């Protein structure tokens, strides 16, 4: 499927442990609200615009 690294952002997020994805270009992680510990190496497909 897609967005395999959804759970970790939530799981670390409870304790506010920072998470850094290498391969997740997925855009849904850009909203700080839902994933607030997310750290992204590269910009989403949205930023491709």
């Amino acid at each position: 499927d897609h967005l395999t690294p959804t759970p970790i952002s939530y799981t670390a997020g409870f304790y506010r442990i920072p998470v850094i994805g290498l391969t997740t270009r997925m855009s849904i992680y850009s909203d700080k609200s839902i994933h607030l510990s997310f750290l992204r190496t590269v910009p989403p497909y949205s930023h491709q615009a």
Partner: protein
């Protein structure tokens, strides 16, 4: 949010602001309010979000 509006209407407090946080449902809360506040003829004022 609707009940909050009804409560405000009951005391006729027309002018109000919303302080929110990034906590879940914040964006919609604004949306639901935007529809509920907007539909009515009355000139109540949203000051800040």
């Amino acid at each position: 949010a609707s009940v909050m509006l009804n409560i405000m209407e009951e005391y006729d407090w027309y002018i109000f602001s919303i302080v929110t946080t990034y906590f879940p449902g914040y964006q919609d809360f604004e949306n639901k309010v935007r529809s509920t506040i907007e539909n009515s003829f009355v000139g109540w004022e949203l000051e800040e979000v």
